[PDB]
Amino acid sequence: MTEYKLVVVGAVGVGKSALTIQLIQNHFVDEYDPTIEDCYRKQVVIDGETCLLDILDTAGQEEYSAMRDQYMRTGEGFLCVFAINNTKSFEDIHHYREQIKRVKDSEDVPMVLVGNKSDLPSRTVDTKQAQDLARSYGIPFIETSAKTRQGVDDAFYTLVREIRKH
Ligand SMILES: Nc1nc2c(ncn2[C@@H]2O[C@H](COP(=O)(O)OP(=O)(O)O)[C@@H](O)[C@H]2O)c(=O)[nH]1
Ligand SMILES: *Sc1cccc2ccccc12
Ligand SMILES: [Mg+2]
Numbered sequence: 001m002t003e004y005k006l007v008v009v010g011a012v013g014v015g016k017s018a019l020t021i022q023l024i025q026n027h028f029v030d031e032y033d034p035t036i037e038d039c040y041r042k043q044v045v046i047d048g049e050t051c052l053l054d055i056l057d058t059a060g061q062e063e064y065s066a067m068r069d070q071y072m073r074t075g076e077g078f079l080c081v082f083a084i085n086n087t088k089s090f091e092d093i094h095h096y097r098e099q100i101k102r103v104k105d106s107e108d109v110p111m112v113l114v115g116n117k118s119d120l121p122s123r124t125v126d127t128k129q130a131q132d133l134a135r136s137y138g139i140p141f142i143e144t145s146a147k148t149r150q151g152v153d154d155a156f157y158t159l160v161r162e163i164r165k166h
Contacts, residue, residue, distance in 0.1 A: 001050055001051070001052060002049065002050075002051055002052065003051075003052040003053075003054055004051060004052070004053050004054065004076060004077070004159075004160050004163055005054045005056075005074060005075050005076045005077075006053060006054065006055045006056065006075065006076070006077050006078070006079060006156065006159055006160075007055075007056045007058065007071060007072065007075035007077070007078050007079070008020055008055060008056060008057050008058060008078075008079045008081060009058050009078060009079070009080055009081065009096045009100070010058075010079075010080060010081035010082055010089060010092070010093075010096065010114075011060070011082065011086070011088065011089040011092045012034055012060045013034070013083070013086070013089070014081045014082050014083040014086065014089045014116055014117075015081060015083060015116040015117060015144075015146045016057050016058060016081055017029070017032040017034075017036075017057050018030070018032065018116075018146035018147070019079075019081065019114070019116060019144060019146045019152060019155070020040050020055055020057040021040070021146075022146045022147075022149060022152050023040075023042075023055070023152050023153065023156050024040045024042050024055070026149075028146055028147045028148075034059065034060070035059050035060075035061060036057075036059060037056070037057065037058055037059035037062055038056075038057055039054060039055065039056050039057070040053075040054075040055045040057060041053065041054050041055070042055075046157050046160050046161075047161075051160065053156065053160070055156075056071055056075065058071075069103050072099075072100060072103045072104060073103060073104060075104075076110060076163045076166075077109070077110035077111060077112075077159045077160070077162055077163045077166075078096075078100055078109065078110070078111045078112075078159075079111075079112055079114055079155060079156070079159055080093050080096050080097065080100075080111055080112070080113050080114065081114045081115075081116055082113075082114070082115055082116070082125065082130075083115070083116050083117045083125075084115045084116065084117055084118055084120065084123050084124070084125045084130075084143070085117055085120050085122050085123060085124050085125070086117075086124065086125075087124050087125055090115075090125045090129075090130070093113065093133065097111070097137065108138075108166070109166075110159065110162035110163045110165070110166045111137065111139045111159070111162065112139055112140045112141075112142055112155060112158050112159045112162060113130060113133065113134045113137070113139055113140070113141045113142070114141075114142055114143075114144055114151075114155050115127070115130050115141070115142075115143045115144070116143075116144045116145065116146060117145060117146075117147075118143045118144060118145040118148075118150055118151065119145040119147050119148050119150070127141075127143065130143075139162070140158050140162070142154050142155040142158055
């Protein structure tokens with residue numbers, strides 16, 4: 001059956017691991033080693049079509065490695081994650097976006113922009129400015145909380161739809 005290869009990228013601490021573990025294991029893990037990169041696989045059903053998701057939860061020290069480049073070439077879609085209380089992580093999106101397009105040598109790569117930690121009160125990044133950036137990229141924007149589950153399945157499933165459309 002169909003497999004979708006997803007790569008979760010973004011600055012350290014934005015919640016890549018928390019998002020991935022919430023999606024797969026349905027619980028919020030609050031102090032997951034920042035240095036661990038790993039693959040999470042799970043069978044799921046999406047719009048009826050039964051699926052295998054292969055999700056790469058990236059670690060920052062691997063950024064310029066030959067292995068990262070191969071993983072990006074293999075990856076079919078990218079969840080580009082920032083935190084809504086961390087402006088720098090939002091500004092880093094530009095960097096990850098350009099890297100993915102370069103490494104995969106394409107201007108149209110399946111992607112979703114994710115603004116995580118939506119449960120936190122101290123917002124520094126407006127939804128509108130994230131929506132504006134996503135529009136400029138021509139990709140969906142989904143706001144999530146790995147802690148509460150809000151938006152998590154939508155983020156990942158929407159990325160699968162983006163891969164289908166491609
Ligand atoms: N309140 C809240 N905390 C979060 C959320 N996602 C991650 N965190 C916390 O933010 C920190 C970094 O999360 P982590 O998943 O390790 O980030 P990574 O470096 O992108 O893998 C951890 O302390 C998590 O508990 C969220 O949606 N809400
Ligand atoms: S989850 C996983 C494991 C190995 C290689 C991958 C490439 C791209 C996406 C996900 C991967
Ligand atoms: Mg992590």
